[PDB]
Amino acid sequence: ISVRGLAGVENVTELKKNFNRHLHFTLVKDRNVATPRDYYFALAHTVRDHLVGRWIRTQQHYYEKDPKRIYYLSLEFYMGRTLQNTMVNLALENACDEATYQLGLDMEELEEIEEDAGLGNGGLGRLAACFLDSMATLGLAAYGYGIRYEFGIFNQKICGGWQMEEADDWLRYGNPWEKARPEFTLPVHFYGRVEHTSQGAKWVDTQVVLAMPYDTPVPGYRNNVVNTMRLWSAKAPNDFNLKDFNVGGYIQAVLDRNLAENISRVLYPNDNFFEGKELRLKQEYFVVAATLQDIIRRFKSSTNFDAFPDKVAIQLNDTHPSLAIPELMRVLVDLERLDWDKAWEVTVKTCAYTNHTVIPEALERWPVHLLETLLPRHLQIIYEINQRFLNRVAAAFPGDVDRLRRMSLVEEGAVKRINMAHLCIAGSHAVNGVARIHSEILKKTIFKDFYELEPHKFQNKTNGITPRRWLVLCNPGLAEIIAERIGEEYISDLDQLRKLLSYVDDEAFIRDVAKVKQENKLKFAAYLEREYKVHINPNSLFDVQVKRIHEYKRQLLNCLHVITLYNRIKKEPNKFVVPRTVMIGGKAAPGYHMAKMIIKLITAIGDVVNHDPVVGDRLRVIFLENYRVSLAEKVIPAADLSEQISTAGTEASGTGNMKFMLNGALTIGTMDGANVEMAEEAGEENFFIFGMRVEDVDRLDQRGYNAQEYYDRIPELRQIIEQLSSGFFSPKQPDLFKDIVNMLMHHDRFKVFADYEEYVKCQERVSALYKNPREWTRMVIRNIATSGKFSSDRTIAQYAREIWGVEPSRQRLPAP
Amino acid sequence: ISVRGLAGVENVTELKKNFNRHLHFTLVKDRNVATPRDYYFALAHTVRDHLVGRWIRTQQHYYEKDPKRIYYLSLEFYMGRTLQNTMVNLALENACDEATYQLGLDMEELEEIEEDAGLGNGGLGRLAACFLDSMATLGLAAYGYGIRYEFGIFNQKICGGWQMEEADDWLRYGNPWEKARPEFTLPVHFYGRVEHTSQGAKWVDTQVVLAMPYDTPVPGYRNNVVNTMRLWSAKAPNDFNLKDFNVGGYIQAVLDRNLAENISRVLYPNDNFFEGKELRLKQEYFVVAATLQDIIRRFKSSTNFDAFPDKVAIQLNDTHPSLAIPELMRVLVDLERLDWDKAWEVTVKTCAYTNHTVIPEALERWPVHLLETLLPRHLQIIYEINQRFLNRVAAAFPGDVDRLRRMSLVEEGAVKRINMAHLCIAGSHAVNGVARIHSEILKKTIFKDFYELEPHKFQNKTNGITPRRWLVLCNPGLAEIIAERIGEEYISDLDQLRKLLSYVDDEAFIRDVAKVKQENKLKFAAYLEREYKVHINPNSLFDVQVKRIHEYKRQLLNCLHVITLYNRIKKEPNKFVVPRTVMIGGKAAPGYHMAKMIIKLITAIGDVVNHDPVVGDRLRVIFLENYRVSLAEKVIPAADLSEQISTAGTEASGTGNMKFMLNGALTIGTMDGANVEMAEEAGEENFFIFGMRVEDVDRLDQRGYNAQEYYDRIPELRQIIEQLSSGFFSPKQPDLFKDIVNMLMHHDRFKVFADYEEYVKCQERVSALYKNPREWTRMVIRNIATSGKFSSDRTIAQYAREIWGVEPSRQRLPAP
């Protein structure tokens, strides 16, 4: 078997008896009534047993050495399953495989029983998860802090071509990886009012909610380091949530506890979109308030807070945890009694902010009346922060009255609001973009005024992905052939993949790389019929676009191409075309009407195309249901063509693109986000770039975008639009897609037509190359061998050195 | 050390390493940061490990042999802590004591960390718990079925002398004894409507709620038998509780899941009182519906249902689970398609009902409009049952038109209601009282008409208590001296306690029995200052009345006596009186105003009495806070005088009375419930009986009860009443107790004054005896030696033989 570790004689024996121990004592089952679910749990507990020893010494280590601690605050941690990832990082995979085999079980079958920890929406949440893995692997004293939602991202179901949402009860059968820590339970305050006394302000008459922490282990790759992800759960106190007497009902008071506990009930399913709901704000203050108390308690142990920034670094994943700035001030000033200026100095030096998008509708602008009611003291602090900041601006740009209102954290208008992004820049010593282009756009556009005031704050940290889960775990076959030639060191040193460049003309390697891709495609094609049922051709080109459904991601542009391919086949049926299986997957936020309309269009196209006999097996349109982390681990290694076609300037970075490049897929996309640095790394000749550049989009906006023009000059595009309008794709409901057509023609913010011609032309070139297996594979080797830069180990090493001020280390912790 | 088992060399070593295993692997802690709570859990898991082996073979045994199964349906199971009880029944107590000692820990300190499983209100729920223990010890294939409330009986707090209720979050830190079984999850239906088709009725358009079972082990006493208590948890389905589309909000739909799950949220805190709330009815159908499906699934394995009663017996603990009758019919007729008559025959033969009270306000009469909306099909079945039953009556008593309406399950009037007790008698082959007197009263009064129709159905089964928890566990000192003389066989054969009669004149025994009582009192007096703080004299007579607060229990009569004692001391200060510490404890249902007023009176009396310098240490009035199972295990072994003073004919049986008799306390009470059989067993000369007999109460009711008469002829009583009226006990609020005085004088349903004179006279006699240690102790020996009849092992053996048709067995199951 592969390099999934050694199957030692002693360790396979030990594993088996512990598997049985747990099956008996933990699951209280006996082989004759054990269900596959019991077997999965016995294995999970047996594997978990192996890292508790290390988890304890790692945490004890940090206490003795007392290094600077990194706190990663995010309202999202898109973890996925954790059994395999743990076996991988512990080098237990083969041993476990062997042991379960001897017990007469199929490890892979058991792995599929684990539920995904879908506590994220998409890119932002998966980044945090990749980051955690890298911070552990780089030996950093880091903690991931978040919310333990009992309901993660909803499970997607397609009914009659429409998306149906359903509760993700991932904790239903229990979570063997987490461990409640009811000793560090903390109180969080809401509402109340502010009393201004003789020696300071006081936050009074507040409603209390308890925050109970649950720790989940985060093992580093083969270095015996296990860090911690602490997730908070909301709990109602037993007193006031019953003790506030004078009629109401005792039963009612108890049932009403599910009101304070609703704070950690569900994740908001919005990807790159802001919904100003009170419940959201409560979740945001909740994770911040609890986390800070825990951070300060740890520090008090390790009261001059001058050294606080020297021992603490808190990273803000977007503006979601932005209340950490005025909350740190509140504690330091109101509770610790530090003077404002000393408190502010400490706050700025420990906080750092990460921006993830430039679209306006994703920007967090909280109505003042909301903050005023829920967090009265924080609003006072934000006004004071704003006051002192604007004074800094006025002093720097005398008379620039327009700049003053532009930079204010407080936005005037219909209803006053607080611009959380402005708050973050002001109270952080570093603000970074997630890709070189996005970072530049921040300085030139969105945060130009802030950049002019404090240029030193703005940085860039291109995103990355973990090679462990995103290669070794999901593509062992590819990882193995690579290791056969260059060794195993690249797993934690992805740059070494360049060495593969010298095998680009190797006849054996070219044959292998192509073989694993073929095996991956056959396995996925099988999985497709197994769990979803309705055949696909594994000899075709696997054209896949998987990511959340958005207008800026242009799944619609992908659709126009698919209809074009179909129309050309119908025109010249007996003409040869490279067979394609185009797979589009992703979830739409429940309230996003357009995004839900697009899913219906995709399935509608498949209904026509997949049953047309003239088309045969040359073209299949498949919608990948319930796209999530575990599903991504299956499609990506099987993809040939990765679709990264967002309008230039809208996708901050993207990370799925990097996942595909590492797994042997060629990329067709625009010069957007990280796509630019990928092409720049692999060479533009090894990339399928097309469409407008940022500059072209701006030029078009200056003159004005008119979709009619494109409709008028391109007969193929016109034909498609008239097909949708006449009900060609929706016979029973001819006007079903009027909203899409109407939008495309009159309010397309992402100029889909503007990139249509260059897109189908470019698609022609990829089909041409696919016709030449040898050259296609050689170009694939050029992408893989050049993907090393996109490992989160590189991203983290940069955050560590340029923002946190800590030195990464690949030193093995002193055994378990 | 005592007979808490052997401290084997091999087993103490084994216990220690497993304690450490769990402390490391399970709690993920290391000795340097382990909290006492961690130590308690490591021990709990280590002890639990010892019975899983037996639990599995016991359940596997029942499958192979396939004996008749006993199902005990109760909405209450007042279990209390379970660590010690498990060690006791497994003979692990000494080993564990030794092992934790060597690990440098105090086992007793750790035992106090366990939370009580207060899933009961009082007597009815504790009976079910004692019964479970006896059924396991007698080797019966029995299952306890109930509801897993996440909030049990509220925790009582006394504020300014008033009771304050607060949520009993007993699951907060986790329950190491239960185990979720998500494989046997079942669906339960609510609402909907009935469609009458060609081949039967159909319950349609129902709302579904899932029932998830959790199994907790019930170990028999040293026989290697471990039965199961299955408790249902309400869970919302992920579909419809989200899938019923067309606007509303996705977030809201998820948050609204806590509406279907509210069914198993909290226990109703009503003791002997009926509240017709919809939530209550839902809990009742929920536990019945789930339990029956599980019962039938087990049977289908083991379709002629003729043998159903031969393999199944379901006992109804009161009328709470009474829907089991029309629900069994529904399944058999609607689903299994059996003819009515065959279905009814089977139903009657498998069901048996237990009555627990005769007070009208405790009787379950559900409004028809409620059943009509929530369970439409069941209402139809109940009407059909009623129809056929009344036809039986008319045929037996031709022309007796008044008897017809008296016996109807349907009560006419303001709003129609369903008399659940009538339903139970009609559909059960056996109906029993819980004490000889109560059982007779059922036949002569309440169910006279039913008794005349089917005399063969009515039986008696006097309650009992388990000698394991109620002696060996709480009073090891007494258990030991008894065992020193007669051996250990009496623990599972309480009748052998009679042998102690021959030591009644033994000088050594008399000295020992008195010594353990003195040690018990010193320990309790210490515990009092430890956890509640404010001293008591251990040389005084411990006068205790602990049970739920009720008007029928007459805590008020106890109060009049206490005030009398105080008034006599104030009259003749320098006269000698036997010192007394009277302790009154118990919870009042939150909506029971009078019961809450009584708690305030008790604390008010203590405020006056406990601070009067002339009184000194001769009289202390203490209110025992948060009385519960674990607290009972502490006070009872320390009591000298047990107060069982309910008005004759109101306390069906009582069980606390039996607990006191077994632990060396003398009883002062009325000829009520089981008090009659206790005096009859010990000899009336060894009991302190007083007051009216049932007959006297009736005579008084014939002529008419006038409290003024007693007030007029007894100067001491008059003085007390004028003290309460003038504010002697409530200075700041002089009229604070007007409701109590008003009630006593004008609407006393339990004639407190009528028994006053005979009560204080009788109290004089106990004080006289207490002055003679030797004789007091000799009378105590006569009570203990004669308590054997009140063991639940005797009660169960009788249910088994006279109702269930199974033979108890004390055979050790083939080792673990």
Ligand SMILES: Cc1c(NC(=O)NC(=O)c2ccc(Cl)cc2Cl)ccc(OCCCC(=O)O)c1C
């Ligand atoms: C019930 C049972 C078992 N039962 C458990 O392991 N386990 C449990 O019943 C069990 C499971 C969970 C919990 Cl919390 C408590 C218990 Cl006691 C094992 C073997 C067996 O014989 C199989 C013969 C071959 C066959 O026919 O399959 C039977 C009958």
Ligand SMILES: Cc1c(NC(=O)NC(=O)c2ccc(Cl)cc2Cl)ccc(OCCCC(=O)O)c1C
């Ligand atoms: C943190 C820690 C430990 N820590 C754990 O056992 N356990 C945990 O930290 C721990 C607890 C629960 C979970 Cl879910 C996960 C972990 Cl990793 C042990 C010893 C120690 O040194 C004590 C020196 C003497 C003293 O000064 O007490 C330190 C520092």
Ligand SMILES: *Cc1c(COP(=O)(O)O)cnc(C)c1O
């Ligand atoms: C990597 C990942 C994402 C991010 O994909 P993009 O294409 O960058 O938007 C979203 N969802 C899942 C399941 C992922 O694995």
Ligand SMILES: *Cc1c(COP(=O)(O)O)cnc(C)c1O
């Ligand atoms: C035994 C018991 C009861 C029943 O007491 P009675 O005096 O029969 O009403 C009630 N509560 C607890 C805690 C018990 O242990």
